Design a protein around this ligand. Sequence first.
Ligand code: CLA
Ligand code: CLA
Ligand code: CLA
Ligand code: CLA
Ligand code: CLA
Ligand code: CLA
Ligand code: LHG
Lengths: 40, 146, 740, 80, 139, 143, 77, 40
Amino acid sequence: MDGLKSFLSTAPVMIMALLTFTAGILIEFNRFYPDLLFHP
Amino acid sequence: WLTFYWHWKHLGVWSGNVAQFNENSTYLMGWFRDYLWANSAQLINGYNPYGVNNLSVWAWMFLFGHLVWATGFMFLISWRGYWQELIETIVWAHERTPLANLVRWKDKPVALSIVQARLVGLAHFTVGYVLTYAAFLIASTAGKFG
Amino acid sequence: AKVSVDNNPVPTSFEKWGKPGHFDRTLARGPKTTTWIWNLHANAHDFDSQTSDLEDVSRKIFSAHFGHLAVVFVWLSGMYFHGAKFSNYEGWLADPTHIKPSAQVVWPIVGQGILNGDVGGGFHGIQITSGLFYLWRASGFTDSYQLYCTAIGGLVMAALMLFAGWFHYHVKAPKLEWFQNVESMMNHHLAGLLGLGSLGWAGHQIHVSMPINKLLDAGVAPKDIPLPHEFILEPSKMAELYPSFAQGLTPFFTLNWGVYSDFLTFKGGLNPVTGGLWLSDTAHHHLAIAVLFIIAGHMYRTNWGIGHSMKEILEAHKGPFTGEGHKGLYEILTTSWHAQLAINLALLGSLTIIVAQHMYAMPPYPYQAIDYATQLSLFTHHMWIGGFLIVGAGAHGAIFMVRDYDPAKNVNNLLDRMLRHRDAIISHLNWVCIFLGFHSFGLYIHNDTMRALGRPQDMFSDTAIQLQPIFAQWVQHLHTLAPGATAPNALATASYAFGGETIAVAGKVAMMPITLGTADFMVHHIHAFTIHVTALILLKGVLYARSSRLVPDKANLGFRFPCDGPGRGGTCQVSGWDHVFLGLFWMYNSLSIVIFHFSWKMQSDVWGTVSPDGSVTHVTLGNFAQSAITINGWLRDFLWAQAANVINSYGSALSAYGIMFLAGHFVFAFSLMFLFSGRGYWQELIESIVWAHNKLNVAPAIQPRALSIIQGRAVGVAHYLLGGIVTTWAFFLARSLSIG
Amino acid sequence: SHSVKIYDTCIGCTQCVRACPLDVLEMVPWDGCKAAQIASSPRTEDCVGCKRCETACPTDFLSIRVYLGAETTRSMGLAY
Amino acid sequence: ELSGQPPKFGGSTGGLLSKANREEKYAITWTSASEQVFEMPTGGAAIMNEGENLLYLARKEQCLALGTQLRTKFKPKIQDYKIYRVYPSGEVQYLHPADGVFPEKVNEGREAQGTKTRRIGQNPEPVTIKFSGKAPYEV
Amino acid sequence: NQVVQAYNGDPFVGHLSTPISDSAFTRTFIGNLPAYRKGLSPILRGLEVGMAHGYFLIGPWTLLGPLRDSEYQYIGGLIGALALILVATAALSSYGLVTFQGEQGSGDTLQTADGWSQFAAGFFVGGMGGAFVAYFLLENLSV
Amino acid sequence: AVPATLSWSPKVAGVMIACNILAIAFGKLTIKQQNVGTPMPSSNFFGGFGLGAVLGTASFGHILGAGVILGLANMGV
Amino acid sequence: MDGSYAASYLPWILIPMVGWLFPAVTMGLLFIHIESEGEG
Ligand code: CLA
Ligand code: CLA
Ligand code: CLA
Ligand code: CLA
Ligand code: CLA
Ligand code: CLA
Ligand SMILES: CCCCCCCCCCCCCCCC(=O)OC[C@H](COP(=O)(O)OC[C@@H](O)CO)OC(=O)CCCCCCCCCCCCCCC
């Protein structure tokens, strides 16, 4: 529905979706490659 | 911040234990625990249920500064209208009381003004700040070295 | 039938989801400044201001309450699921005295797997302090499958609550007359909810909880104990455990109730094996209150002319000093939701305060008294909940006074008389607050100065000038003698706090007499001072919300306004909302002192370890009596001494608490940005920053604005309370988990 | 007492007079605006300084300005 | 001089103080078309009687608040109230409305007061008027 | 049987009649106090007030003061009472000097500069006498 | 020392009906709205009582009888 | 309260005046001055 699409596109939903995307990226990277103090 | 850094570094220098500051100042919990918590052991024991030593006056001034610092908060947070209405009620109480109506004020009691309230809160705040830090510093250094 | 509804009043559509701010006329137009955002999140759930029709407001309230019920159901189902899947409840059940409860497991990602400490039995996880394990053991839980089924049922109930809200608003909305059947509502909610709930719980306990707990306390392994339905299916086991069950239900209908004495007792005290209350005592208790509540029902006239009328009772209780008496209150409490909210919030907050103060003295759950962390956590948590609810009552009462109070319907009634001698009330209350604070806190400061000056014989202590609480000691003596003398059929005292023997389980004191001395006198009167001051602030907010000698028209200005202006010398913080904002801090202060007193007294005079000989060694020894009389004692022997476990928590499983401890000390300080400053400075700073962003042609269309004065105060108080409470929470949890 | 000044940018919307709770302001005939009326402050000794008139003024900057000055019993708005 | 039956009131602690008999008080009088309940600015509700009324208050702001309530919160709008200042000696000074026409609407014969012939941005700099007992707006 | 009404039949004053403020017993008892009696000269008023306010002041500092467990106990109580009475007399004199400046209305003899001066002097004398008589009563084996 | 209770006997019955009868006597002279709502067939056998009034007075009689029986069993007879 | 410095009797009399006599006299004089109506 158009109203549902408009609600999903509001500021809090976008900000939280982007934050979870970034957090998932960082968490997965830190899981598969932890303890990166510098480019060795 | 300046005085905390200077004092902790010089405590390490004078005691010869520079490594403690060197490895504990990189994180804030070391500041909280190794500097504040550790160096208050002798200050707050100036007067005990057991007796009194020469640091008793400094402990009293330490608590005194904490108290004045706290007191400034209510000139800084609570504002005028509340106290104005409270003083209105007190004025009613005085004017309606027998044997106290024989005594009357010359200047009508009012609450402190906004700018005066900010100034008084800042004054109590600064006095408490200075007294608390001075008491803590003197007591800690005197107990450690003096 | 008194049911009256309207069919499909509001269509179910998604369009309004795409237009935030639809409820408000001032916000649905579209944002021009950032304030439009903050208003949107602030005026959302204020249905009274949105519309003038009372019926629509009531419908919205009904469905919103359905929504909160659904949320609470989801929370309960989550608790049960996380106790069923990620907990050692089955392990703890076999060895309750050697395994710490734990129901939260932490993923190892960035080293937080260190939080998964060793809780015993080979299980690694976060220790819980809610006491859910003891509640589940008392409820008869023995397997994780039952907990999983409970979680599934909770999720189903949450979905049903959501559907109920949708149906009873968007489809079949009740009429206003339906909501105002206060007699019918009170009857159904006293007899059908409290009485029926108590009867159902008594039935569950008698037919499920007592047999399982009796077998568990004897020494039977959890897996050997029969499943709860097997007791009902084969009553031979029930008759074996309790002989009177062989008699069946015949004595109940013939009033030969005494035969049921074996499983319906009046023992009183604590169960030696578990340290909790006897389940037979609880069974007769909940049965008795069920009977009492069902009898308390059938009291208000609903449909058959047989019953009392609330309006008649209210208008009949009037006297000489009170003019019209309780007249017009029925119309107040049947036309304004805010007055009902105020009364219910005050009573409920006091109720949770009573819960906190009574659940620790007579611990109802098995193995709860010996888990000091759970005791402290439960006490403090429900204490804070009660304080917040009381402040909310003080707020929403002023809201009612500003909005729903009408002078036409209140002439010479109790409300008007209250509004007439409000100056006398406030003046006398202010005087009593000053007197209490002066004399009590001056006893404290006087003791401090006497100790600092080397004159301990001039202090206010048990060795020095006594100041003994003779009345509290007398009532403790009376309650200690009550079994046999004034309650002949009781076997032991209501609690061992008043007096008696020392009940200790697993070499840990569960409950021993709590002696009151000079320090207890001082602290209890300090509590009285703080409570009277908070009451003074909230009462001044409620009474003076309409007007005052300074501003005679505050009612027209609204309930939430920052000031009237810099005139009249300065009129800052005159609204009722400002009185709530000021009372929040004093509630925090009073409750902090209360929880500090509870923690220190519990650690110093009750909790501890009992030797095989019988000697009791307390957590902090007997230092409360000789240290809690000076502020220096409170600072050194309570904060500095007991904060060691939270400052030395780094590198261990408790490290999180330590982190959170510092977190609190941060946010509190952060709040001082908003409380100490004003918005013009920030507006000018935002002007400069807006110029900066404009130079690069990146200025936002939604013009940024500094927070409003009211918003600034609200943000300051919120972050302040959050920081302080989080600090206290971390400190208490670390200390209580580090004292065995 | 406080001072109240009205500048020549007034448009004669009379909002300031309506907003004043102590009847300090007045509407007098004028010619500089389309409404041909301007605000005035004859009874300025009763002003308390609540700035409601300033809040009510819709011009780009307030065509009515209040400068707080000497404080009397009336200015403090005291009832005792 | 000042005539009118006082409204029936039970008495409250929010009323006058010694200032009334020492400095001044204020009086508000109005004609009521029916005996009906209104709200005291000092706290409480009182009934006002058919015909003349007369009420003594401590501040002009309270009198004008009562006048606003009379003008707004009654369908038979009461537009005839009069506010006087009563001195301890006995002098009564007519305050509101000044000329009998409400200040909200423009009436001829009034005199402009406090009106400046410039805009707010044209005020003189303080440094040009310092060491004189004047302020930029005073000039 | 309405017992609470307006203050002297005036609803619009900041007060209302109560069985505590406008009771017949209350008015009779408060009007017969030394400060409110009829026909008393101001110096006699001061004598009567000071006698009581100095007699009762001996109490504290005797069972509570620094010297409360020795033979210098009643002496300390007496000295503290005398010093408090002296400070009270100084405060009374300053209030009389400040309040009554110039215009001396003769409606009340107490509310007058010379009347207040006599009241302060009588208060000092009465406080001395009351404190000393209380000391004499509370002492044992006096010279 | 559990309180003594009485097994069912004709005496306990007689107490029950006595309490119910006196509760009827009380209800006839106290209830403001004696007949409101659902009535019962063949009136004037119940003193002009509706269903609600009858159930209320019967329940009150049962409560009185339970209290009296338990109290009397606590003492003698 | 007892000292071994030269002229140890001075604080026995100087401190009370600085403690009581001087503050009280100053309080009285300032209170009279700030409250003296008229003449400025
Ligand atoms: C002639 C008939 C008769 C007789 C001989 C008795 C005799 C007895 N009844 Mg009894 N009773 C009767 C009729 C009778 N009852 C009726 C008609 C009812 C129904 C209303 C009851 C309901 C009843 C209850 C509910 C209880 C008794 C109990 C008792 C026994 C102890 C009473 C006592 O002195 O201890 C009590 C003496 C005291 C001094 C204690 C009073 C202090 C209380 C706690 C004050 C509480 C204040 C209250 C909560 C606040 C008011 C609420 C508000 C609505 C005003 C005693 C054997 C008690 C029992 O079984 O004991 C084992 C008991 O709990 N009776
Ligand atoms: C009060 C309720 C409550 C709370 C606080 C928790 C808390 C927790 N649960 Mg839990 N749980 C609950 C109820 C609850 N549960 C219920 C009712 C069930 C039954 C269905 C479960 C079933 C459950 C399982 C099966 C597991 C947990 C786990 C966990 C832990 C990891 C957190 C997590 O799952 O995030 C994980 C991270 C995310 C969910 C982030 C994903 C992105 C989110 C959803 C963003 C939301 C927006 C998204 C983009 C979708 C858009 C929606 C939009 C249209 C509105 C954490 C302690 C885990 C655990 O403890 O493992 C050891 C685990 O495995 N829970
Ligand atoms: C026996 C009848 C009965 C019962 C049990 C309730 C119960 C309740 N009413 Mg209620 N009510 C009733 C009759 C009843 N009402 C009548 C007749 C009226 C009209 C006069 C109202 C009008 C009314 C209003 C206007 C409001 C309530 C609200 C509430 C809830 C308050 C929240 C609470 O107590 O948390 C405790 C919560 C629980 C114990 C969870 C209960 C979950 C469901 C709903 C209970 C169903 C029980 C049912 C008998 C089936 C169980 C039997 C068997 C399966 C075991 C509560 C669930 C408030 C609300 O919105 O809540 C929805 C509210 O604002 N009531
Ligand atoms: C049964 C409980 C209850 C109910 C139904 C209401 C209902 C209402 N209240 Mg009320 N209130 C309550 C309890 C309750 N209140 C309590 C206990 C207090 C004392 C704190 C207050 C204080 C209060 C005030 C001061 C005001 C209301 C207002 C209102 C009205 C709606 C506006 C509103 O607050 O929504 C908007 C709600 C919010 C914007 C809350 C969001 C911000 C919260 C505080 C953050 C919480 C953070 C959380 C605790 C931790 C998060 C940590 C983070 C790191 C994630 C409405 C009538 C307002 C009004 O005037 O209505 C007429 C109003 O001004 N209430
Ligand atoms: C309210 C708090 C409080 C109280 C009750 C006390 C009490 C006491 N202090 Mg102390 N003190 C306090 C705060 C307090 N202190 C503070 C904050 C400080 C500064 C940090 C000090 C510093 C201090 C010193 C330095 C000394 C004391 C000493 C004393 C003792 C005797 C001297 C005294 O105060 O009484 C004497 C009496 C008065 C001061 C006047 C009391 C006024 C009366 C009692 C009011 C009564 C009102 C009346 C009942 C109304 C009746 C109405 C109607 C019936 C007519 C006494 C036990 C001395 C001592 O040696 O202790 C053993 C001492 O040397 N105090
Ligand atoms: C400003 C400088 C200063 C300060 C802070 C002190 C402080 C002190 N002196 Mg001291 N003194 C000073 C200068 C000062 N002295 C000088 C210059 C002399 C030589 C005349 C003395 C001679 C002196 C004696 C003989 C004694 C003290 C004593 C004391 C102690 C008791 C309190 C007191 O001063 O009252 C008593 C002391 C005086 C009144 C001395 C007069 C003050 C000097 C001469 C003038 C200072 C004026 C000052 C600048 C005003 C500033 C105004 C400002 C606050 C706005 C105290 C530690 C007493 C002591 O040892 O007690 C333990 C004591 O017996 N003083
Ligand atoms: C127990 C020891 C520790 C606590 C001691 C403290 C007691 C202090 C005061 C005595 C209570 C007297 C109540 C009688 C008073 C009483 O019962 O009034 C009842 C009376 C109403 O009488 P009527 O019969 O006209 O009332 C009809 C009513 O039913 C209304 O419809 O109300 C008044 O007279 C006004 C109330 C003045 C109240 C004065 C304010 C008192 C505030 C302080 C009370 C503090 C108690 C705190 C501790 C609970």
